[PDB]
């Protein structure tokens, strides 16, 4: 019962020609593919990519690798992929990529009665997609995964999400700490180079930031060394030291949280959402400074005039600020 | 000389291709694992390196020999000749096996067709961590196997008697962690293209606490102390009682980023996040006790005296009351 | 100061070797690429050899198989070799130096430039 | 039984051929087309002087030994079969690590014609060297190249040509671009040749000609040093009995700028010369350091010439705004005339 | 000519060879003399607690299967025979990621004497293990071990021996230290037996002894705290009437301790106790904030015992020097000798 | 014309023993080097190596390759490489190198009709060399590469510069950002070891640091910060608060000067050139606020005292900072 099966196999690869693809000459071999999710990690804005981890599969007819006789699947060693066609199936914006081999190759080949070849892959690549940060940090992004095949024309074959719009698994358990998956979708087309057209799937999440981590670590701490500031307002004018030393260490500090986040980024030119609000709080920190300035400039020749001063920024540096807040808040969110 | 008579008679035929019993009945394999050393667990990728020695053990039926000798020991050149399981690691990362000074591997097959099949493996398996109870959190990463390509009609796995064992655990790499026990189960999983076993084992780690009480706690808590100096010193020197309240403000900042850049970019609050928040309350509204003080100075003396004596007993107390019921919350209740 | 000096030419008759040098001073180009153009009266400054530092020549198809340049790193020079020459080729021969902005065959991507050679050939 | 006409083509092309001769040896020179797609234009490291590419590398040839006839007139065949061929041995003569992709096949493609023209493309992640001249940084442009051709054979044997005309045979994709603080204005295609030790060899040159965005910096560095220079000068305007509070003001902006002037070199290489930006932090070092000279000045001749000070302060709130104003004026037409 | 004679030799050694079966399989006990020779001790990494080293690893063993007559009594042959042949499946036990050279060639050779003798050496960059205890740090020494054995011979099978003696088969070279902040006192050698759930396996085993040098600590952690303590005690000098003067000097110095305290922690790995470093800036900062609290003691009773905190500024001015004096004394007594 | 090139190619390897050198059991076989330097960079301290991009050429007689009737120097595709006896040269200082692959493998193998062989390859190498830093960053290193034979001896091979002094070129044509190569020398000599005697060809380089770099970021901050200290002993010695605060302010950021200069470093273990101005120029701001602590302390019984020790200061640190950079800048130029 085992001879026969050797026979069987020993009798597919007897002639076979691993150069010329299934119908050689003919209509174009249609090609599905799966990709199940095991992971994503290293979503980055410094190099701006993303890691993938999947179970990519693929599945093709070839007529040559019919057998009858044997009611079974056979499911052969990996190494049996090397002498047999497959698709050269690559994805565009992969920036490195491998397959995993511990304890062997991570590769799958199944052959049916009727020819049928079911090819899999566990792949981990590193996918690139240009983030758009004028928003950081209520951002949300669109990472993409294009798949395509280098040599063979829609002449020769033809690509198709296997199950439709189930065809990719595993979105919905991905856990990211800094992001929730909103959307997946799947897309089909042609894409035309000056070689000719080629068949394109597109496999893209969209990507929306979580923003309590930067509550506690950029807002948090702005909103109360702006608070902090204010101090100053219901101290005597005439502690110029104690004042100024107040309103220097907050001005100061603004400026170090500013250029601390930035150097956590890449170098984009644009201002994004968090620099507007260091920048907002920054102007609110100096003119409290700026304030004294004037106070103390002027309280020798009438206190009268230096003390109502003193009053009513107590009264209108909180009022502003939290307009500033409303205004920010309700135009981002 | 005979043996290899032996050898090349049991090769002569033989398709490396056709699992044994492929027809027949699922290809059983025993599996054994010793765990050289847990090495470090990386908070910020979640993940952990572990380095083994990973056994397997199974029949074939087409490896049987007559004679004296009754088991061959042989080493890795003929691991590429005889069928092998296509056993990976599911929540692996980036693992590799070992090449110096050859390749790390073992092959013997007794006259009766057993092959025991050995392999040095380093894993970087994925292992997610809830860090809501960070530094006082517990974790069981995990670290499952199973066939690529052949479903549970085909392969199964099965635990040996003594199935993981591990050698001396002070000299693993685990610096933030300590080994508590381990487990390993079996189970179904269900893909799309078949129905595979899946073994796994579980590691228990449990966090060491006392790299960031120097880092962090104690840090934060002389902070605090420092600015209750501001109550003894005389309500009069303004500027005095405005640097010493301005500037632990600003150290207490810095201590709040450097606890954080441990951890991932999570968006919630550890318990690490809720002791640097509280520390933060309390410098500053001892600053603001003072704002307080000085605007009452020359309107209402009398109140002005009363107010430095209550938050020279209030704000010790508070602040060990504080202590009390976060500790106790984190190390008896959690 | 940055100064390119050319030294070199006069007159030829009907062809013959008359090879042009440049000194460079007061920088030192090795990351640079040093050319040599060539304004004939009234027509226009035309490009005629550039060399970058990995040793790359670049030539006009005029020229192309006629003129030779060489770089001397060492001694922050370049030097061109004028072979068969013609009346066509009497005219002022400039050296320059530069980064090849928008181009290495343009002029204006040249920064430093010599005060020209006279190359005059009699036929 | 179909495809078996085809086998008995390839099996009959490649009986004798030998792969380790050049098409043409010993009687003409192998003339190989070229030209590049740009898939994406790749991030700039001002640190390391270089640059990432990816492009689609074509290459065309003639081959006489694999003329055929049969029912196609150009065979689309496996990528390798290239290995089975002679190709060209084209190398980057700047290349620092390059990456042929193989994922999840080798990224190549090969179509033979009847006539024996061969068309062979191959995907690859170029990394090549870019040096830099940073004396106008950050408002400096580059002129990044890309050179290539063969290994082993000088111009006697093989020779490079565009496919067509060369400003139209390098094409970069429109929606490539991944770079962040620069801009790619355009590129220019060239031909060249190289005298080496071995022979010579002809080189095809692409330059890319980018120019760095100012922006980052202009938020990062220069409106920090603005800020500072101004918050030094409000300093004279508080009243000359706040010798505590003047002093604060003098030493906390002297000690902001040692920190922005350390801060401002970390992305640069470590070079050996003063940038554009080096210029603009020491000038606003020298105001902000005046500004605290001023100070002491006025400090000491309080309570012994108390008008000459009062005279000092009145000249300072509008000698040091003025000069600081003016010298904007010069410095940004300077640098963003060029 | 003479070429075609070796060639028959060589073919009729390999000639039915059989690589699968170790030499005197049945018979007797293979006998692998091995010896180490350090050409460069790498650097040791804390962070890791791993060190590297590259050595040329000799190991040589009697082959009856390869006796042959000619006119030569050593056949030096090329690397690629070794792949031909039985070679001993040597693993480092504690060996993390290592390299085997392959640059320009696989760095290896083959030397086959008359008798059947093998001499078989490589070139390695290894990278071993190294357990670290920093109770001790930074005046601690470790014993760096490196154990290697056969991986799938028993030491009935196949056992390891020195080619000279112990303590002479372990060579390292003169000018090879590339260690930074250690120093390579000795090593010693010795071989073992381990056992596994499949056989007792021989193993050798090397262990160098390293110990750190304090010159960079002292520089970097010791004199910032010795002279931020000694600022600290400025402070006991100025008047009581400075009482701002005096607060600045308190806080500066115990927010100094705290920038010191965290700095210091960088390069270790993040271990959960306490070393010799973490013991001298905890009183360091103890001093420090002491002197925070004596002011505040002083300030405290002026205006209502003006003759106490005068008596209190006078001892102080004594006990802070003459107790730091002291606590140092006894921290580097301690330290130095174990 | 063809068809006899490959009929002579395939009569050479044809019996040809790959195990064995040329001229085997006989004379040693001569091997001359070329090396053709593309670039040096990564000069790095911190992990005490250096990058070397090169064209490394070899060049031997092989009479076993020696063919005629072709009057032409037959450059073979660089696969013949794999079937041919090349020597097996390696480089002892070498921790990291790979020949580049892309578009194949950078290599040439050219023949010769009376049996000579070119054989070339693109390498890049990360060599090693310990650096004295006692002079940093005043300082001149002296990095090599070695060049040897693994498995033969000096009774088989032997090495040569081909070209005596001009085997090595493409130095002149370096551009290192930090250093300036002063000079290069090439060695000839051979190495004993336990298993035999090796020649050994050794190239060296001696790279002289640029100070430029360290003005700007390291000497000058020092400087300004020591006369910013200087500022203290212009203004009236009862204003206690006011030069505190400038005292202290120097002190503490020149320690954070020195701490922030040591982290890109390896950490050697004694004094560099440039420690030794930050612990200079810290004992100046040092004594400087260690003088006002004598000011104040003196100024009430002895106010005249007080006034003379402030006017005297403003001369003596002046001038004697500047007697240490004299000392200072001649000892180490
Ligand atoms: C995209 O392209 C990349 C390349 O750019 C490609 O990566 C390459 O992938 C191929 C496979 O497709 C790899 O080739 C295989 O490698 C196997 C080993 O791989 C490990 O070791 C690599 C280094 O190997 C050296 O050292 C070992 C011993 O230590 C030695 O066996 C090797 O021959 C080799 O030795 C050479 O080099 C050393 C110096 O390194 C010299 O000292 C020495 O003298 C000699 O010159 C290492 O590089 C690998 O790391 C890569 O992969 C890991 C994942 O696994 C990854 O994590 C890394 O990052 C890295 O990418 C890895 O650790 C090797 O065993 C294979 O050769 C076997 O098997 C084949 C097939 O059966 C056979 O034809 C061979 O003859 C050979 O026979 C084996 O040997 C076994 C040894 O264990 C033995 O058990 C078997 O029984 C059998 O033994 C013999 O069998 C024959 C025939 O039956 C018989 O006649 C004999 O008597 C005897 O019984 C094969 O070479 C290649 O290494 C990869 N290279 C790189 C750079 O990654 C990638 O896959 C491509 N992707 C896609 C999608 O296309
Ligand atoms: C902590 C900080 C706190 C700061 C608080 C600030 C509060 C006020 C807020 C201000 C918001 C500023 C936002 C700036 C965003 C970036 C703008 C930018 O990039 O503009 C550039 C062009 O502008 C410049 O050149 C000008 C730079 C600034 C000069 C300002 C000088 C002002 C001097 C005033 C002196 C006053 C003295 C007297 C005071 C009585 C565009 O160039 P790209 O298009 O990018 O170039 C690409 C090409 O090169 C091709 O590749
Ligand atoms: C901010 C900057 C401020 C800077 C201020 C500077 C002021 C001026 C002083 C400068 C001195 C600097 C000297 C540094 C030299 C380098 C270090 C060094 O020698 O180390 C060692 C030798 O040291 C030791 O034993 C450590 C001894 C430490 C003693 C400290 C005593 C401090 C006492 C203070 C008391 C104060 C009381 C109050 C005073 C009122 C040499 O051996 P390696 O090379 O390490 O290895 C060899 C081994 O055998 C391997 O095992
Ligand atoms: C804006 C925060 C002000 C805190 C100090 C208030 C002091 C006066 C209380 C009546
Ligand atoms: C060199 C330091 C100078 C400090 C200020 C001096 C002011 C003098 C006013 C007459
Ligand atoms: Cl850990
Ligand atoms: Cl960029």
Redesign the interface.
């Known amino acids: 019962n085992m001879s026969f099966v050797k026979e069987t196999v020993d009798k597919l690869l007897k002639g076979y020609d691993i150069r010329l693809r299934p119908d050689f000459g003919g209509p174009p071999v249609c090609v599905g593919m799966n990709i199940d999710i095991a992971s994503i990690d290293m979503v980055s804005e410094v190099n701006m990519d993303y890691t993938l981890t999947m179970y990519f599969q693929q599945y093709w007819r070839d007529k040559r690798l019919a057998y009858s006789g044997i009611p079974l699947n056979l499911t052969l060693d990996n190494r049996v992929a090397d002498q047999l066609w497959v698709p050269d199936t690559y994805f565009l914006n992969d920036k490195k990529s491998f397959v995993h081999g511990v304890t062997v190759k991570n590769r799958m080949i199944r052959l049916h009665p009727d020819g049928t070849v079911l090819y899999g892959l566990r792949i981990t690549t590193t996918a690139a997609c240009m983030m758009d940060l004028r928003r950081y940090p209520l951002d949300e992004q669109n990472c993409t995964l294009e798949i395509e095949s280098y040599g063979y024309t829609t002449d020769d074959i033809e690509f198709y999400w296997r199950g439709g719009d189930k065809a990719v698994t595993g979105v919905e358990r991905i856990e990211l700490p800094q992001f929730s998956i909103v959307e997946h979708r799947l897309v089909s087309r042609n894409v035309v180079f000056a070689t000719g057209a080629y068949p394109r799937l597109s496999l893209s999440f969209r990507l929306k930031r979580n923003i309590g981590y930067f509550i506690l670590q950029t807002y948090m701490p702005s909103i109360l060394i702006t608070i902090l500031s204010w101090v100053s307002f219901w101290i005597n004018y005439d502690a110029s030291a104690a004042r100024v030393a107040l309103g220097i260490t907050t001005v100061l500090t603004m400026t170090t949280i500013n250029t601390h986040l930035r150097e956590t980024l890449p170098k984009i030119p644009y201002v994004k959402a968090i620099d507007m609000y260091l920048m907002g709080c920054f102007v609110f920190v100096f003119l409290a400074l700026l304030e004294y300035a004037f106070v103390n400039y002027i309280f020798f020749s009438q206190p009268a005039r230096a003390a109502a001063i003193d009053r009513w920024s107590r009264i209108v540096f909180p009022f502003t600020f939290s307009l500033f807040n409303l205004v920010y808040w309700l135009y981002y969110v | 000389g005979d043996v290899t008579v032996i050898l090349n008679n049991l090769l002569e035929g033989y398709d490396n291709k056709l699992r044994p019993d492929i027809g027949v009945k699922p290809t059983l394999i025993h599996t054994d694992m010793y765990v050289n050393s847990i090495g470090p667990v990386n908070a910020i990728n979640m993940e952990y390196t572990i380095d083994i020695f990973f056994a397997q053990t199974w029949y074939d039926r087409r490896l049987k020999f007559n004679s004296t000798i009754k088991v061959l020991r042989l080493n890795s050149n003929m691991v590429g000749k005889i069928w092998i399981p296509d056993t990976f690691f599911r929540n692996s990362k980036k693992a590799d096996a070992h090449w110096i000074t050859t390749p790390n591997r073992m092959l013997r097959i007794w006259n009766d067709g057993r092959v025991l099949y050995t392999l040095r493996l380093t894993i970087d398996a994925e292992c997610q961590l809830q860090l809501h109870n960070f530094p006082m959190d517990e974790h069981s990463c995990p670290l499952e196997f199973s066939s690529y390509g052949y479903p549970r009609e085909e392969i199964v796995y099965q635990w040996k008697r003594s199935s993981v064992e591990v050698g001396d655990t002070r000299s693993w790499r685990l610096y933030q962690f300590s080994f508590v026990g381990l487990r390993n189960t079996t189970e179904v999983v269900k893909t799309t293209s078949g129905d595979y076993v899946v073994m796994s084992v579980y590691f228990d780690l449990s966090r060491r606490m006392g790299y960031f009480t120097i880092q962090t706690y104690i840090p934060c808590t002389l902070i605090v102390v420092l600015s209750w100096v501001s109550f003894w010193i005389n309500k009069d020197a303004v500027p005095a009682r405005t640097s010493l309240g301005i500037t632990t403000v600003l150290t207490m900042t810095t201590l709040s980023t450097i606890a954080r850049k441990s951890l991932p970019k999570v968006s919630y609050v550890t318990a690490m996040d809720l002791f640097v928040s509280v520390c933060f309350i309390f410098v500053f509204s001892a600053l603001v006790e003072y704002g307080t003080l000085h605007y009452f100075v020359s309107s209402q003396p009398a109140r002005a005296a009363k107010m430095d004596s209550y938050a020279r007993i209030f704000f010790p107390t508070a602040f060990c009351l504080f202590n009390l019921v976060y500790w106790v919350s984190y190390l008896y209740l959690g | 100061q940055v100064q390119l000096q050319e030294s070199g030419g006069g007159l030829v008759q009907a062809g013959g070797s008359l090879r042009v040098s440049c000194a460079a001073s007061g920088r030192?180009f090795?990351?640079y690429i040093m050319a040599w153009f060539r304004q004939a009266p009234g027509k226009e400054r035309e490009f005629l050899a550039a060399m970058?530092?990995?040793?790359?020549?670049?030539?006009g198809d005029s020229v192309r198989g006629r003129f030779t340049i060489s770089r001397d790193?060492?001694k922050n020079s370049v030097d061109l070799q004028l072979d068969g020459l013609r009346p066509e080729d009497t005219a002022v021969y400039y050296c320059a130096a530069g980064?090849?902005?928008?181009?290495?065959?343009t002029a204006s991507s040249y920064h430093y430039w010599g005060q020209g050679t006279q190359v005059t050939v009699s036929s | 039984d179909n495809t078996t006409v085809f086998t008995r083509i390839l099996d009959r092309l490649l009986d004798g051929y030998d792969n380790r001769l050049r098409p043409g040896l010993g009687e003409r020179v192998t003339e190989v087309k070229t030209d590049i797609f740009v898939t994406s234009f790749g991030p700039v490291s001002d640190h390391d002087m270089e640059y990432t590419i990816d492009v689609f590398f074509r290459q065309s040839w003639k081959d006489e030994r694999l003329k055929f006839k049969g029912p196609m007139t150009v065979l689309r065949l496996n990528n390798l079969m290239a290995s089975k061929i002679w190709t060209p041995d084209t190398f980057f003569?700047?290349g620092k690590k390059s990456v042929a992709h193989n994922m999840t096949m080798p990224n190549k493609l090969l179509r033979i014609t009847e006539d024996g023209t061969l068309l062979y493309t191959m995907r690859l992640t170029v990394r090549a060297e870019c040096?830099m001249?940073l004396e106008d940084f950050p408002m400096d442009?580059?002129?990044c190249?890309l050179?290539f051709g063969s290994y082993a054979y000088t111009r006697a044997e093989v020779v490079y040509e565009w496919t067509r005309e060369p400003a139209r045979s390098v094409v970069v994709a429109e929606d490539g671009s991944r770079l962040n603080q620069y801009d790619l204005?355009?590129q220019?295609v060239?031909?060249?040749?190289?005298?080496?030790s071995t022979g010579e060899y002809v080189?095809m040159?692409t330059?890319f000609?980018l120019k760095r965005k100012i922006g980052y910096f202009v938020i990062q560095t220069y409106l920090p040093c603005i800020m500072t220079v101004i918050l030094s000068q409000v300093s004279f305007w508080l009243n000359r009995e706040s010798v505590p509070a003047r002093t604060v003001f003098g030493v906390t902006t002297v000690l902001t700028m040692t920190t922005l002037s350390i801060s401002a070199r970390n992305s640069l290489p470590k070079v050996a010369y003063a940038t554009a930006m080096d210029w603009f932090i020491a000038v606003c070092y020298a105001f902000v350091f005046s500004a605290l000279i001023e100070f002491a000045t006025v400090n000491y001749f309080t309570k012994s010439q108390p008008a000459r000070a009062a005279k000092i302060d009145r000249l300072s709130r509008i000698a040091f705004p003025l000069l600081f104003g003016i010298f904007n004026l010069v410095y940004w037409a300077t640098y963003l005339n060029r």
Do not use: C, E, M
């Open positions: 030192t090795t990351t970058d530092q990995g040793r790359i020549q670049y030539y790193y060492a980064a090849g902005f928008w181009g290495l065959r | 003569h700047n040096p001249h442009a580059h002129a190249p050179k204005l355009g220019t060239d031909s060249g040749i190289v005298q080496s080189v040159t330059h000609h």
